[PDB]
Write an enzyme that holds these catalytic residues in place. Structure first.
Site, PDB file in Angstrom:
ATOM      1  CB  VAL A   6      -6.394   4.943 -69.235  1.00  0.00           C
ATOM      2  CG1 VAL A   6      -6.478   6.336 -68.862  1.00  0.00           C
ATOM      3  CG2 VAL A   6      -5.787   4.828 -70.026  1.00  0.00           C
ATOM      4  CB  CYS A   7      -9.921   1.055 -70.183  1.00  0.00           C
ATOM      5  SG  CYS A   7     -10.345  -0.995 -70.202  1.00  0.00           S
ATOM      6  N   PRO A   8      -6.229   0.446 -70.660  1.00  0.00           N
ATOM      7  CG  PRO A   8      -4.354  -1.039 -70.939  1.00  0.00           C
ATOM      8  CD  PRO A   8      -5.863  -0.858 -69.957  1.00  0.00           C
ATOM      9  CB  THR A   9      -9.366   0.448 -74.756  1.00  0.00           C
ATOM     10  OG1 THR A   9      -9.775   1.369 -73.730  1.00  0.00           O
ATOM     11  CG2 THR A   9      -9.878  -0.991 -73.648  1.00  0.00           C
TER      12      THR A   9
END
Ligand SMILES: [K+]
Ligand SMILES: [K+]
Ligand SMILES: [K+]
Ligand SMILES: [K+]
Ligand SMILES: [K+]
Ligand SMILES: [K+]
Lengths: 186, 186, 186, 167, 167, 186, 186, 186, 186, 186
Positions: free
Chosen positions: E45-48
């Site tokens: 995932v985009c570690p957002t």
């Protein structure tokens, strides 16, 4: 495995030379003792064995060895047997009664389904340690002369630690002295 | 006690006359057996007892009696011992190794302290029943002659049920016959 | 596993250079130790592994490393083996007998269904901590020179905390050094 | 010890040559295996135990031996490590992730106070039996040529039982 | 739930602004804290979620709130992640490693079959008491502005008990 | 925590729009659900949180989400509150009474020393799986629009497996996609 | 107490008029039985008690009442006593030996500390139900026709159901007929 | 059995000659006591038994023997019975009520299925030791001077230690003196 | 809490109108029943209460209600009391004896330290369900007219499910009909 | 049962005359107390029983009697109920909330099925001892007049120990005095 364990305390009435006495473990302390179990007063195989020991009793006493016969009968019964059997009549050692079975069970020697002791002989040293054990089936008599052999062997070993009495050991034989040198050569 | 009890199943390796074999309780079925325990290969006292039994061995075999010596050593160690001792060399009965202790504990004969068997001899009849027991301290040798006497006596009671052979008995001498009438008379 | 745990107390008889001695955990304190287990004296294989250690023993002693071989046979049996086999005769370190199995079980190295130890080697430091373990199946040789290598490495890290020896280390080579300067890069 | 016992079942994700794969004990059947455990990816040491195995991997493959490195890091983390370090980049065997610790405890090889595996190597034969074990402290290196030596011996006794030197 | 209970003691290594540090519960005393859990470094995932917290970190620091992200990866792995991803590189709060899982189980936040933490956020006041909990499944995002909203409310009721709207 | 576990069976009385009804876990099957817990009817605070959900209930029903508020008061007491408070009067979802505490304990949300539920919200999907949990202390408001956000996200991932919603998602924004093409880079 | 209970099974050896027999509970079925316990053969108080019973024994047999004396001595010992005491010699009923103590414990009649039965007499009907119990201290002798008095009364009640026998009645005097209103009248 | 045991403590209400009293074990100390149990007031067999005792009661008092009758009815009920039956009316000894059943269970004398005491009589010496026990079936009445016979015999033994009283003895006839050789002689 | 539980099986003797009968739970099935416990026959407070119920018994019977008084006294005792007290004489319902206490304990109504029942009254419906319970201290009399009130209330409720009898309920009053409309308005 | 037992400690919140207070067992010490349990605020039957008690409240207060009503609802719900009902509005005694159920379970009065208290009334004396209990089914109202009668009677026996007040008793009428003489006469 009761070999080489210390006997357990006990207190029983016994018949000895026309008297009733009390015997306890304190009587055995500092003495050699033979505990001679048998199943039943007024039986058959039993007297010849007890009489046989009686034949050796003078010598056992000279060697500082006391003898106690034991059955689950009462001391009262022993006195009677002693008066009616001429074999038993020659017994001069203590005849212990063990109607509670406590003494017999201390020595793990009960026929639990008969409430009678098994044919067992125990040699106990002055420190209360069991040094020899013999138990035979209902039909097989013991041998008091072999009993004498073992007691003398046990007494020897006690008096000569570091030395041992070999197979066939009898009076005055070469003994063995454990050592690094003796290992695997015999 | 183990008197008059049936022996328990076992499966052990042994050295016997130059080969390795397995021994189990099944090998004893229908045979008289002597189980002869001792503490350790390569020691001092042990061979003399073992050699003496070997001296009686054809005679035992003639009586249908198998001999098994037992220690907590391996069958390899038995084989080695047999090569280096002229006494052990004389042995033609099976030398069982019991390194797990299972066989020894079956006969309740372990020094748990030491991992060695006590000096015990057991006589076992064809039905698996223990008919005689002897256990002695480290310094007290057994006597293979008295062993034979008991065995001959054991076979006799087996062969003559209603009669028993009393103390010191050996072949050809008088028996006693338990019955009502005889009660209390010798 | 037992890696990086402290050895447990023990008390055993050993054969060492023609004498019987007692070994305890107190004998290891302040010393480096190798506990070298094997299954059985007097088997049919050449005891090459033990001979290889004997070959390296002078050097090991110079590094202040004591060696103990261990099997479940008695020290008596070790003495006999040492007299009978040319390879074993080379051994000048202590040969511990473990017939109770306690030392073997302390190192969790018993084959419980056989009563014999597995082929395991343990390196133990002066504070009693196990720093290396090797166990192999029958036929897969333990190399005494790999043993030396691991020991020199263990002594090195003990003398140089803050440095560690990667795979590959022998005396003279680069060491690795705590850093934060350091990773996913090497 | 676990010597001469059969390995226990397992199912782990791994990184192998640029892909993610699943590894189980069924993948070991019929093969020789080396399970090479270590405490942590991305750490302070020259990861030269793994590089050393990589160096010998071709040879191990010729002996029909598979290699599995194992730590308690994820397969995700193995992939990142493999793409940042020139030494790890050499690895073409499977890098198993064991974040639950299950595989590690199967080999009784967990440092419970740390959540990391000890430095242990295990050799497993085609029937799943452990034939050799090695465990070392953190400063003591595992030698790959000694591993090869032990694998070839294990294969030899397996094909020729009975041929060892008398006394 | 663990709502309104005191956090349990802990000792973990962390990566924070280019150094390794040790964090314990003694570091939380007298401070507001956010414990931000997630399953795995270096993942798909985009570690957002973490980037979002970073974006708000200055503001959180002005409210005297410390932030701790936590996963079951090592502090070693956090350092590597922080030096490979531009999003993670923005993080200036402590990245706690929890490879034993002890900190995670303290917050009853472990996925036992995975060895990874669930997506949980915890707000802890200066006396170590948990004042808010949020846990979500893997597809459901944690909103940082909602976190701020909850922290400011928790601080407000703490300074002004008794001022809530009657019925 | 209970995240990602299945809700447990339950059977409770509720007040819902002027009638008493029974609610069970069967009523939730195939539906999205919010279980909205709170400590007590008729306290002194304005029940703003419940009103906020009422405000969003038409929209929630369009997304096929059922709402259940729960406290340990009876459904009788819920009915009274609903008649007496203007905020509560807005509620058209089911108000479950849980005087045994079983529903509250199923969600592990009981204050055992008070006999009241904590301020917790649970989102439950049509297969009965809990997809989101929120718990706050008194005075820290649960925002109904954050609730809507999490639900739309949960419904989205359910409709689009293989995609996941990072923090930030509202309808119209980018999604993330399983890849191997992907990491330490984002 | 054991009044009005069924006797438990047993198997014992016994002496009776010069033969050994096996007695079991089966031998008592359909018969009236008196179990006459005492502590020890060859004592003092016991014979006077047994002989007293023997005097009455025929009269007991005409009533179809069997007598069994019991002590924890063996049946062997009873035979011996029977031949040595003029008083014991007059006994023609079965003297049971109870060396296991089982029969004594069945009647709850053991002095556990001594291994001897207490001075108890039990009357047992043809269906095995104990109808009367007497126990006295070591120094207090029993009375043989008190027994007889109790037996005939026990027997009359059995053969004339619906009637009960008041205090002191001897053969030929009146009995009571139980029910509704004699109550409180006598 | 309870023969030769010490009575247990108790506290009961009782009726005696128009007053209510509390009886406890303390009231029996230094006195001889007869505990006379029966199942139920206002029955049929019971009064004949109690009245029989009352006839003898003075003679019992001259011997320093107190009488306590016991049933599980209340002391209230005894008072009622005492005023309604001419037979119960002649009782001047204490009638103990035992509604909890504790006193009855102390003497192990409860019919648990019925809540009534069995027909048992107990003789208790000044030291509280039970010296004689009698129990009969529902239909078999007791005999008041058999009791007297047993009491005087019990008392003589106490006052003349070293002597025991044989069967049937009444005042003035000879006793036995226990020891060594009267054995097997009478 | 025995309210609203089903009575447990029982079997007791009772006195009813000059006869002894057996009562069991089967007698109570399909009937209304009053179980009237009291501590002791021949006491004081007890009769006036029992007599009082007797005064109402004709009406209770017309309403299909049976009455059972219960004490731990025997039925024998009840018969006697019934003949000697002119209050008790007017009782025409069953007087149950409970000397084992089993019935009293089914109703958890034992004074365990007295072995007497407490002053308790239980109303039991035709399905065996306990609908009303009253228990008072030793000094506080019950009120049979209030008992009548409750039985009529219980009977009404049975006959009009969905309807209830309020505080002060008597013959022919407005009753309440549970409903959504009635909640919180009263 | 709980008759004649001491009440257990508790600490509960209550609504009383317009305020919230805490109540504990300490508040009851030295006072007469009535604990009045009911199932639920806002229902139908409950107020009429509660209002009736309030009607008797100054009179109860004049007698030194405190009243506590108890349900598993909160003190908030009690306060609300008090505002919306003209009947509950009349209450000036404490309304205890027991949402944990601890107070209810102390009096063994929980419907575990429902999380509501049964309709039970308990009278407790200044020493904490429960002197009267009443429990009725859901449909059967209590009667505060009979409640007063019991209380007045309870105080009387407290104030006149050796006398008791029998059934239907109210002020000024005749007492009974337990004594020996009176046994069996009314
Ligand atoms: K005996
Ligand atoms: K061995
Ligand atoms: K990890
Ligand atoms: K991890
Ligand atoms: K009674
Ligand atoms: K509640």
């Amino acid at each position: 495995s009761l070999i080489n364990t210390k006997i357990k305390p006990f207190k029983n009435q016994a018949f000895k030379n026309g008297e009733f006495i009390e015997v306890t473990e304190k009587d055995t302390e500092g003495r050699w003792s033979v505990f001679f179990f048998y199943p039943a007063d007024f039986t058959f195989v039993c007297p010849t064995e007890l009489g046989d020991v009686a034949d050796h009793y003078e010598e056992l006493q000279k060697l500082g060895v006391d003898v106690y016969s034991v059955s689950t009968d009462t001391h009262f019964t022993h006195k009677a047997w002693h008066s009616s059997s001429e074999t038993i009549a020659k017994i001069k050692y203590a005849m212990i009664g063990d109607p509670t079975g406590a003494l017999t069970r201390n020595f793990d020697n009960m026929r639990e389904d008969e409430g009678l002791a098994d044919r067992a002989t125990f040699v106990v040293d002055p420190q209360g340690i069991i040094q020899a054990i013999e138990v035979t089936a209902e039909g097989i008599g013991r041998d008091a002369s072999d009993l004498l052999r073992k007691i003398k062997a046990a007494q020897y070993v006690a008096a000569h630690p570091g030395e041992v009495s070999p197979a066939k050991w009898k009076e005055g034989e070469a003994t063995l002295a454990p050592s690094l040198d003796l290992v695997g050569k015999i």
